Amino acid sequence: FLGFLGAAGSTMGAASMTLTVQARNLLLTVWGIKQLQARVLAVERYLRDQQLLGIWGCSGKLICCTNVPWNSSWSNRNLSEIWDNMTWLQWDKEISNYTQIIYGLLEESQNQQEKNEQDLL
Amino acid sequence: FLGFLGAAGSTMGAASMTLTVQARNLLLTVWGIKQLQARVLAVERYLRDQQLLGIWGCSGKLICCTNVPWNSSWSNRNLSEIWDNMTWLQWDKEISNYTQIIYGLLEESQNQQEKNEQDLL
Amino acid sequence: FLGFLGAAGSTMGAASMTLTVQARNLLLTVWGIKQLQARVLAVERYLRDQQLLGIWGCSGKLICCTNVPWNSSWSNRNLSEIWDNMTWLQWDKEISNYTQIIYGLLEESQNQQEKNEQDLL
Amino acid sequence: WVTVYYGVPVWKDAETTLFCASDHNVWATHACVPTDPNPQEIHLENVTEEFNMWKNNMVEQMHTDIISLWDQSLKPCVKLTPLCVTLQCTNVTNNITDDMRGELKNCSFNMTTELRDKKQKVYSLFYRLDVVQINSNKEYRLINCNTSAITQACPKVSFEPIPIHYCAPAGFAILKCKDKKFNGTGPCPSVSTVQCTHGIKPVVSTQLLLNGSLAEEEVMIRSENITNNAKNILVQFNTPVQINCTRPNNNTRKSIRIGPGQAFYATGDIIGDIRQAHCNVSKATWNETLGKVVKQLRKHFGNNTIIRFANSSGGDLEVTTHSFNCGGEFFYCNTSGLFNSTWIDSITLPCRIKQIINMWQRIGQAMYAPPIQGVIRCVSNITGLILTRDGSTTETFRPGGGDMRDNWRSELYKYKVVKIEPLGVAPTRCKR
Amino acid sequence: WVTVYYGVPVWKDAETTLFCASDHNVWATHACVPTDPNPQEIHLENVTEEFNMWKNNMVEQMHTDIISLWDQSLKPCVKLTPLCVTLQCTNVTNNITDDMRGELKNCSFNMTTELRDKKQKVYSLFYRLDVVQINSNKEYRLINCNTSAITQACPKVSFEPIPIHYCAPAGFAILKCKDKKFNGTGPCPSVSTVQCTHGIKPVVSTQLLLNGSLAEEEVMIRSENITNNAKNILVQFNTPVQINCTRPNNNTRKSIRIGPGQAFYATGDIIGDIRQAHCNVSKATWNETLGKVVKQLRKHFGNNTIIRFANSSGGDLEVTTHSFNCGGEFFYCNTSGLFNSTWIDSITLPCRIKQIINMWQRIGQAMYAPPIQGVIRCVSNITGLILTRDGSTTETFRPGGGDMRDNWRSELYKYKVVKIEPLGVAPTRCKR
Ligand SMILES: *[C@@H]1O[C@H](CO)[C@@H](O[C@@H]2O[C@H](CO)[C@@H](O[C@@H]3O[C@H](CO)[C@@H](O)[C@H](O[C@H]4O[C@H](CO)[C@@H](O)[C@H](O)[C@@H]4O)[C@@H]3O)[C@H](O)[C@H]2NC(C)=O)[C@H](O)[C@H]1NC(C)=O
Ligand SMILES: *[C@@H]1O[C@H](CO)[C@@H](O[C@@H]2O[C@H](CO)[C@@H](O[C@@H]3O[C@H](CO)[C@@H](O)[C@H](O[C@H]4O[C@H](CO)[C@@H](O)[C@H](O)[C@@H]4O)[C@@H]3O)[C@H](O)[C@H]2NC(C)=O)[C@H](O)[C@H]1NC(C)=O
Ligand SMILES: *[C@@H]1O[C@H](CO)[C@@H](O[C@@H]2O[C@H](CO)[C@@H](O)[C@H](O)[C@H]2NC(C)=O)[C@H](O)[C@H]1NC(C)=O
Ligand SMILES: *[C@@H]1O[C@H](CO)[C@@H](O[C@@H]2O[C@H](CO)[C@@H](O)[C@H](O)[C@H]2NC(C)=O)[C@H](O)[C@H]1NC(C)=O
Ligand SMILES: *[C@@H]1O[C@H](CO)[C@@H](O[C@@H]2O[C@H](CO)[C@@H](O)[C@H](O)[C@H]2NC(C)=O)[C@H](O)[C@H]1NC(C)=O
Ligand SMILES: *[C@@H]1O[C@H](CO)[C@@H](O[C@@H]2O[C@H](CO)[C@@H](O)[C@H](O)[C@H]2NC(C)=O)[C@H](O)[C@H]1NC(C)=O
Ligand SMILES: *[C@@H]1O[C@H](CO)[C@@H](O[C@@H]2O[C@H](CO)[C@@H](O)[C@H](O)[C@H]2NC(C)=O)[C@H](O)[C@H]1NC(C)=O
Ligand SMILES: *[C@@H]1O[C@H](CO)[C@@H](O[C@@H]2O[C@H](CO)[C@@H](O)[C@H](O)[C@H]2NC(C)=O)[C@H](O)[C@H]1NC(C)=O
Ligand SMILES: *[C@@H]1O[C@H](CO)[C@@H](O)[C@H](O)[C@H]1NC(C)=O
Ligand SMILES: *[C@@H]1O[C@H](CO)[C@@H](O)[C@H](O)[C@H]1NC(C)=O
Ligand SMILES: *[C@@H]1O[C@H](CO)[C@@H](O)[C@H](O)[C@H]1NC(C)=O
Ligand SMILES: *[C@@H]1O[C@H](CO)[C@@H](O)[C@H](O)[C@H]1NC(C)=O
Ligand SMILES: *[C@@H]1O[C@H](CO)[C@@H](O)[C@H](O)[C@H]1NC(C)=O
Numbered sequence A, B, C: 001f002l003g004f005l006g007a008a009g010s011t012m013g014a015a016s017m018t019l020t021v022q023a024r025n026l027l028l029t030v031w032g033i034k035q036l037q038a039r040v041l042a043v044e045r046y047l048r049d050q051q052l053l054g055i056w057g058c059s060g061k062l063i064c065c066t067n068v069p070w071n072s073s074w075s076n077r078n079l080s081e082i083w084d085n086m087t088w089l090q091w092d093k094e095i096s097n098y099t100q101i102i103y104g105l106l107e108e109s110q111n112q113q114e115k116n117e118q119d120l121l
Numbered sequence D, E: 001w002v003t004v005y006y007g008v009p010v011w012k013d014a015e016t017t018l019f020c021a022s023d024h025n026v027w028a029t030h031a032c033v034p035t036d037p038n039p040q041e042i043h044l045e046n047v048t049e050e051f052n053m054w055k056n057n058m059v060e061q062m063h064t065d066i067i068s069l070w071d072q073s074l075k076p077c078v079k080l081t082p083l084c085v086t087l088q089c090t091n092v093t094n095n096i097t098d099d100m101r102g103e104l105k106n107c108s109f110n111m112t113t114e115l116r117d118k119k120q121k122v123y124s125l126f127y128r129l130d131v132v133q134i135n136s137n138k139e140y141r142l143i144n145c146n147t148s149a150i151t152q153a154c155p156k157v158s159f160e161p162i163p164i165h166y167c168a169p170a171g172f173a174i175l176k177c178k179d180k181k182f183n184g185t186g187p188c189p190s191v192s193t194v195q196c197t198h199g200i201k202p203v204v205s206t207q208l209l210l211n212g213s214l215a216e217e218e219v220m221i222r223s224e225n226i227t228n229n230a231k232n233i234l235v236q237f238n239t240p241v242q243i244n245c246t247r248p249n250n251n252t253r254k255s256i257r258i259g260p261g262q263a264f265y266a267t268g269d270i271i272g273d274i275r276q277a278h279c280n281v282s283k284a285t286w287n288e289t290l291g292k293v294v295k296q297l298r299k300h301f302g303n304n305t306i307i308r309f310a311n312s313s314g315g316d317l318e319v320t321t322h323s324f325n326c327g328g329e330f331f332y333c334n335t336s337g338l339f340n341s342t343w344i345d346s347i348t349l350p351c352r353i354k355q356i357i358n359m360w361q362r363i364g365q366a367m368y369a370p371p372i373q374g375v376i377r378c379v380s381n382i383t384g385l386i387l388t389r390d391g392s393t394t395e396t397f398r399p400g401g402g403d404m405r406d407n408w409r410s411e412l413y414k415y416k417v418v419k420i421e422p423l424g425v426a427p428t429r430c431k432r
């Protein structure tokens, strides 16, 4: 169908079916340094996102359903508006100020879960 | 027993017990550039294979049983020939032309599975 | 609470609740080479630990409960001493000589498990 | 309720390092990635994106990259320090058209030989713009002797402006605006994603933009601030104006050995007579083109305003004339014949030629351009102008230039670099 | 049914960058990885692999690496530009054996001193092969003055051919063919995997291959195309032939200061008498060796064919003679005494010596080899030959050479670089 970022203008629920399209595009000595720095950075950025998914318990997944409740103060909208009207670019702007709060909560709930699962073994 | 690639001349089912042997071997400024390029490439090649296993739902595994049926047109042989007579080098040649078809199918079945698992939660 | 390595002087069971604190801190052409080498190495060291967790069946986890029994010859202590009195620095010294034995056993038990799980499908 | 998604089609503005790609050159040779023979472009439906060509760091990067490549191509070439001597010069008076009397000087000097013990008496021709009279009225020195070291360009490495494609590193993307009649700022619909830019030729020129791209429908006027007379106006044509330039002199070249493995390339005697270099612009085409430019300027200045064109203001040769490199020689042409009108066969523009070139705005690194044997003829497209407004019922436009970033800004105006940010979270009705 | 496996023992041919490893050198010093004191080799049972020594890019890489290291070792050394002067030369006639009359010239010249104001009259000895008569019949110049700049090798950095191990980067492997009687192409059984190559000494020579490895059982003949007379034939011996070379002259060295921190090393007077440099090859050993070579050539040319050996064809000194570097001095020996026979004490080969050396086939970078004090004696192993066939009942073989890749191809013929491809899929009887 569409290629890289083709779904960017699509709604959030129309997009999110194309997650592999974007995931696969993330992968004279002075000239050589510039190119190596570009390559090393692409790797470091990739790994930081993977580490973060790992500590949230979402390793290996493109869609990860977590155990953290949504706070209506972050965005008081119904699923119909979020998934059928909005695009991901619009959404990212809407909740930009809550991203770090959400990330902190995701880490904490995984730590609690990981320990509960040890006690049950 | 055998070291790296020692099982290369072994049959496919004799090999495939040595998967960790090979997996662990994948890891003057101009001279320095040549060495850095070699190191950066080894990392990039490694990560591309890992990303690919991830999108197929095989992250963290050396043996991953999937939900895609085998098409007899890819190779019309019984398990006895494939696992007891053939080596992996011979097999790789036999189905070289179908590798990209198989990879595409593996990605699609994971996308369907991943969504079904969200709807069930 | 505490930041990076703040729990270093804490007991093993007091620590091990801070695993994400340390995990997240692992991430003129001649000057440029020195900096690129430092960055490439940090990536290579990170990936080697991740590969090792993967082959032991612990991918994506900070706490991984395995199926290998503890040999009392490695350290004849009760859980009370290990988790409530000792620190991780002291422990690492105590069993330094058994690390490679333990690692070999962890790889073997995963290979057996991985095959048993294939036969059951 | 919180569900984490990875691979989300979201991006942010970013500044990164782009690499060059391309299909004995001064610029890109082997330190350049081979291009993709089947490049992609993806139309993004329903995407509006804000662009600003005046804040586009791709321009700053290109400026830096071409200067550095240029210097690397002079680094291994012969130094001409031994040439900075007293010259004994006379005029070349043999079959000279009146227009060039005094332009060429026949200079003799004592040059070194391969052996440290011996000197040789040699002579060569220089342009008047290359030398300075000192003191003995025949004594001259090269113009750069009190300012900078001079090196000879290696006569095997060409100045041909071979096109370069810029490509983004993984994790980044280049967005292109395809909105016709985009004036360089503000939002535009019709955005597509590309792997790399089209090939851009690193053509160096002043006043007139040569061999570039054309506007899709109409002549377009673009500026950072159209009411600020301190800013330049870039004019992009929708049709080319063909310009034919030549150096009608059958020059010969001679090699003077000046050391153990080094040689100087000198201009020898000229075969035939001496004629002035010049460029021809078709008059009718120029007039139609100038017509279209005025019609568009009136959109910003008033349709009852008198628009006058005037020639350039004073300054150095490199600024007041139309400078370009063609056939391997550096021309400085007088454009006062093009910009001399109120409101809206051929036009002949006389040109001067130099051998000692100070590139860009730098001081300290001069180069000597070896002479080219035979007659040079060049044909090129004028694809746009750089104008400056002289500023109550009339406005005067004059040719401007001298800042090379303006010549790249005119090709890179459509491209933006963004960074991909694949993680995101959203509420869903599920629980782990 | 589809099961994915990772860590599968599969590989493909590949070309990559190998790095050097090793246990004040011209070549590998600190930019080289310390070797593994306990290297591995793994035999691969039931593996047949196709090798082709004539298409082995490890050879091209080695050629490039040694040239670049060589240049980096001359870069910081003293330039001898001030030496390119008119020399006043006479013959050295003091106690000269008849064989060398005219070989050494005693030359005086005006050299610069540390101070820019003063010059000094100095003298040194040069070989006739280092100078050119000009014009005044005593006037000479150094041979390189009309062609190239010359630098002095730093007399602290040695030319000793210290062995280098090539190692593959992770994800790649080097396969080695252990099949005895492998002729360089086609499949072979008995393949093993190694971390790195054995140490290979970067010995530079023509015609005769020195100090290399030997064949396991028999003399072997290898060529790209044995019936194409335009190709070279590499002959690998299964036994060494010992060769003893010497420069029997007790030379002295003197240091001439030529500037503020720079000095030239000149050959001073020679103590004792003047004798010709030479190499000794045992006659019986050579004859037995040549015997074995012919027996093997007959396998390709006929066992009733007359095989003749002849000396080299004309060309420059660097091609027609046996060139080698030993003891720090460059020898050019006449091998016509070795290749002069039909079909199959000591043999003395006279040698010439040069101080001005043009390495490989390059022009523009000459080096001056400082003289070595005292008497030089070298003992080395001839481990093979490079032959060219001159081509209906007889074939003539002549010494060949001049292309250094042939001297590395002879050591790297057993190695191949492959890329590991760990993913694979296969049918299994299971379902997720
Ligand atoms: C605008 O675009 C046009 C069209 O692309 C461009 O004109 C081209 O200029 C180059 C260089 O002046 C011309 O190439 C020359 O063609 C002649 C034809 O006989 C050749 O002899 C020349 O060869 C010499 O120079 C070579 C340089 O590497 C040497 O290698 C060679 O040995 C010779 O010395 C050279 O190829 C080209 O033909 C024109 N194109 C046309 C269609 O005329 C123009 O210059 C651009 N304008 C600007 C200002 O850049
Ligand atoms: C084939 O292999 C043989 C054996 O490896 C090799 O012969 C060796 O050559 C080197 C250099 O000519 C010899 O080393 C010299 O030995 C004398 C002995 O007294 C030393 O005095 C020399 O020292 C001087 O040079 C040093 C260079 O770094 C200086 O540091 C030092 O201050 C002195 O100036 C030097 O060590 C070596 O002994 C021989 N080996 C044998 C067994 O004779 C031969 O050259 C190889 N053939 C070819 C063509 O490469
Ligand atoms: C530049 O000056 C030189 C030197 O006077 C001119 O060359 C001389 O021309 C006369 C004419 O017969 C010859 O006899 C001389 O031998 C020439 N001198 C040399 C050194 O060759 C030269 O022609 C002048 N060039 C121009 C273009 O005027
Ligand atoms: C560019 O060409 C024009 C046209 O020939 C030159 O203009 C002349 O300049 C002098 C300067 O005082 C005037 O007196 C003449 O009347 C001008 N000519 C015309 C037709 O008006 C101009 O000088 C040239 N520019 C340069 C830098 O040489
Ligand atoms: C000057 O502009 C014209 C018109 O854009 C260029 O000619 C076109 O070149 C493209 C390149 O593929 C062709 O497809 C068009 O058909 C050409 N148009 C015509 C009318 O022939 C011309 O090449 C430009 N000149 C220079 C020097 O770049
Ligand atoms: C090379 O030439 C020099 C210069 O003639 C010779 O050195 C001279 O030898 C005589 C003999 O008594 C001395 O008186 C001179 O003072 C020496 N000159 C200098 C500058 O020292 C030198 O011997 C010749 N060398 C050879 C090998 O023939
Ligand atoms: C290499 O050594 C041989 C043997 O001494 C030289 O051969 C002589 O060459 C001349 C050239 O015409 C012949 O007339 C002689 O008869 C040759 N000698 C013999 C024994 O036949 C040969 O010239 C030397 N090569 C070089 C390059 O000096
Ligand atoms: C010339 O070849 C001989 C025979 O291969 C070399 O001598 C051998 O060197 C190896 C190195 O460990 C020893 O193990 C052998 O025992 C030696 N053989 C004998 C008979 O002593 C000799 O070193 C070679 N010469 C050179 C200069 O490399
Ligand atoms: C763009 O908006 C229209 C409006 O209906 C929609 O149909 C179209 O699918 C959108 N684009 C994409 C890529 O979905
Ligand atoms: C929801 O967020 C608000 C502030 O954004 C916070 O005060 C409130 O306690 C949060 N609700 C819960 C249940 O944590
Ligand atoms: C995020 O912070 C900015 C800072 O100016 C603020 O204007 C914006 O409204 C905040 N967003 C939300 C959703 O509150
Ligand atoms: C090589 O083939 C023989 C044939 O029976 C087999 O026994 C042997 O095990 C094979 N090699 C390996 C490494 O399995
Ligand atoms: C099997 O492959 C063939 C071509 O290789 C294709 O036509 C066929 O439809 C495939 N079978 C199935 C069930 O998809």
Ligand SMILES: *[C@@H]1O[C@H](CO)[C@@H](O)[C@H](O)[C@H]1NC(C)=O
Binding pocket: B094, B095, B096, B097
């Ligand atoms: C794969 O493609 C090649 C192309 O020549 C063909 O010869 C080969 O038979 C194909 N393999 C199969 C299994 O069809």
Ligand SMILES: *[C@@H]1O[C@H](CO)[C@@H](O)[C@H](O)[C@H]1NC(C)=O
Binding pocket: C006, C007, C009, C010, C011, C014
């Ligand atoms: C240090 O030791 C004291 C001893 O009781 C303990 O209370 C304290 O918590 C320790 N430090 C840390 C970081 O736990």
Ligand SMILES: *[C@@H]1O[C@H](CO)[C@@H](O)[C@H](O)[C@H]1NC(C)=O
Binding pocket: C071, C072, C073, C074
């Ligand atoms: C425990 O370790 C000792 C040596 O450390 C070993 O001999 C013993 O067999 C091990 N026990 C088991 C059950 O493997």
Ligand SMILES: *[C@@H]1O[C@H](CO)[C@@H](O)[C@H](O)[C@H]1NC(C)=O
Binding pocket: C094, C095, C096, C097
């Ligand atoms: C580990 O090896 C060292 C080597 O000296 C030894 O002293 C130490 O006691 C060993 N550790 C244990 C726990 O045995």
Ligand SMILES: *[C@@H]1O[C@H](CO)[C@@H](O)[C@H](O)[C@H]1NC(C)=O
Binding pocket: D093, D094, D095, D272, D273
């Ligand atoms: C002028 O050109 C003619 C062409 O025949 C030539 O003969 C004459 O010598 C030239 N004049 C001078 C002064 O060189």
Ligand SMILES: *[C@@H]1O[C@H](CO)[C@@H](O)[C@H](O)[C@H]1NC(C)=O
Binding pocket: D086, D087, D088, D108, D109, D110, D121
């Ligand atoms: C060359 O040097 C001599 C030395 O006297 C001088 O007279 C002559 O004018 C010099 N030549 C030139 C062209 O300056």
Ligand SMILES: *[C@@H]1O[C@H](CO)[C@@H](O)[C@H](O)[C@H]1NC(C)=O
Binding pocket: D183, D184, D185, D186, D187, D222, D223, D225, D226
């Ligand atoms: C370019 O278009 C934008 C769109 O709003 C406008 O604001 C801007 O002023 C225009 N440029 C000029 C020179 O008027």
Ligand SMILES: *[C@@H]1O[C@H](CO)[C@@H](O)[C@H](O)[C@H]1NC(C)=O
Binding pocket: D225, D226, D227, D228
């Ligand atoms: C353009 O320049 C004028 C000069 O004063 C200034 O007042 C005006 O605000 C500028 N326009 C913009 C958009 O900044």
Ligand SMILES: *[C@@H]1O[C@H](CO)[C@@H](O)[C@H](O)[C@H]1NC(C)=O
Binding pocket: D242, D243, D244, D280, D281, D282, D346, D379
């Ligand atoms: C330029 O030359 C072409 C032929 O090469 C000619 O058709 C064209 O009219 C010329 N242009 C001018 C302005 O003379």
Ligand SMILES: *[C@@H]1O[C@H](CO)[C@@H](O)[C@H](O)[C@H]1NC(C)=O
Binding pocket: D287, D288, D291, D344
């Ligand atoms: C340019 O075109 C306009 C169109 O009205 C015409 O009036 C004017 O005279 C033309 N100029 C020349 C030089 O032909």
Ligand SMILES: *[C@@H]1O[C@H](CO)[C@@H](O)[C@H](O)[C@H]1NC(C)=O
Binding pocket: D302, D303, D304
């Ligand atoms: C300029 O053109 C616009 C286009 O609508 C028109 O409204 C305006 O009145 C015109 N001005 C003059 C002076 O004719």
Ligand SMILES: *[C@@H]1O[C@H](CO)[C@@H](O)[C@H](O)[C@H]1NC(C)=O
Binding pocket: D311, D312, D313, D314, D320, D321, D336
């Ligand atoms: C512009 O034209 C005027 C006309 O008098 C002339 O004086 C001036 O020098 C010209 N400018 C240039 C740069 O030639």
Ligand SMILES: *[C@@H]1O[C@H](CO)[C@@H](O)[C@H](O)[C@H]1NC(C)=O
Binding pocket: D336, D337, D340, D341
């Ligand atoms: C400018 O136009 C006037 C109009 O006749 C003309 O006289 C003058 O020479 C022109 N200037 C140039 C530089 O051609």
Ligand SMILES: *[C@@H]1O[C@H](CO)[C@@H](O)[C@H](O)[C@H]1NC(C)=O
Binding pocket: E093, E094, E095, E272, E273
């Ligand atoms: C020749 O050698 C002898 C050895 O005693 C020496 O005395 C004599 O001076 C030498 N001859 C010459 C001309 O140097």
Ligand SMILES: *[C@@H]1O[C@H](CO)[C@@H](O)[C@H](O)[C@H]1NC(C)=O
Binding pocket: E086, E087, E088, E108, E109, E110, E121
């Ligand atoms: C050194 O310079 C003087 C200067 O006249 C010259 O006569 C002498 O011959 C030069 N010496 C040599 C060896 O060339």
Ligand SMILES: *[C@@H]1O[C@H](CO)[C@@H](O)[C@H](O)[C@H]1NC(C)=O
Binding pocket: E183, E184, E185, E186, E187, E222, E223, E225, E226
């Ligand atoms: C080397 O062995 C292969 C094996 O088939 C053979 O084809 C080739 O011709 C042999 N080389 C020569 C020089 O005959």
